[PDB]
Design a protein around this ligand. Sequence first.
Ligand SMILES: [Mg+2]
Lengths: 185, 290
Amino acid sequence: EDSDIAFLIDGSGSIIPHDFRRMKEFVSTVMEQLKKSKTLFSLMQYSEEFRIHFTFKEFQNNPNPRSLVKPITQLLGRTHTATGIRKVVRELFNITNGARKNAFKILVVITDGEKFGDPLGYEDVIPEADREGVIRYVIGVGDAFRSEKSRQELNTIASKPPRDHVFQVNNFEALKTIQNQLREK
Amino acid sequence: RLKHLIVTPSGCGEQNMIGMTPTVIAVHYLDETEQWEKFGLEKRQGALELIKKGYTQQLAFRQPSSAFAAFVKRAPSTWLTAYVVKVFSLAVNLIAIDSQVLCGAVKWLILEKQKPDGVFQEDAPVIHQEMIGGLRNNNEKDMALTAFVLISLQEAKDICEEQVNSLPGSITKAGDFLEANYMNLQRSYTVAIAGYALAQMGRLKGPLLNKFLTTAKDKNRWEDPGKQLYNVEATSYALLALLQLKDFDFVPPVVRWLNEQRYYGGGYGSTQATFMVFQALAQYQKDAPD
Ligand SMILES: [Mg+2]
């Protein structure tokens, strides 16, 4: 009944606007039907550059998602995923931004699986995510499963097990999957 | 829509090429992109026929160092000297041309058209500066030239390596002159082309990149007011300059815009962009897994 959920969404040029449209209509529907046990939400859009759209407080004061999410727009840069990771857990998952003591930390990365131009690699930002206990789901988009390195970068983003951590974007099941994964917590 | 590109070559010095480029860029987009199914397929040689009529006519006025001007007795130029060379790098797709001719051209372009420092002074400007795209009234004297030479040369690399082993030097020191002196430019045109040639030499990594990358207006164009042909051409320079680092982020933006402009080649003067418009739209589909 303690719970803090973050969103690290890819906003790179490899995200086509429909993917971005579909990200916004997706992240919303998770919110609307999940005002539960005081579930707390934060988002940050990442690309070559990064934008904390709301922290937990800015979120705590306004609970109406559709009003929150419609205006969010695209950044059209490269893909700095891992550098966006540490910034979420160091900035969004700081108490100074609304993070509650003794809450469950989950991060929902919405990316297309192609790390690009990140001066940080992935090997830096995961075992810190392990040492600090964020549950890391990955919501892969577009052509993320067609090729090889794009799906492998995903399982490298998600925590183990991946059968409960890595999901597809179109499936509207992941939310029920965390919903029941919390429901039993 | 693209039915207005097979054109009649004509004209003393370069209009044959002016007509040869829309006659050579079609068979280069259409072919690689597997678009040879709506028409019936009986023309393909007609173009190669058309091509063997113009490029051959383009050789009615060779010069002793294999040089090319519009005019023979004249001291020959270097834009038509190397640009008809680049119109041929797309000809190799289908047409049968010989190869000693270009290496016998480049040997002169390095013995008498490059300075110890990587400069390239066009020791003969031409009478048709409308065919040249965005090279007329820029201040940047010979930066845009030094890289336009470099790209024309490097387009037909791994070709003139046997007959002329001088070439790699002219490429390197010209690109060196670029990289040490690429950051200090103002306009995007010069940004775009010289970025690509360092990309040809693989050397487009670093702040030199940032400036070129930066200059993207809304991430989908290199904005200048000179003419859309300058912007559309340099967008197609940066796009080829993009496929060479295998970027698949900044590419769809460009593709989007480059596919809302609804340009399909055509018009007096519309010579440079025509080539580049579909040369880059073609190499795109060659790399992009579809
Ligand atoms: Mg990307």
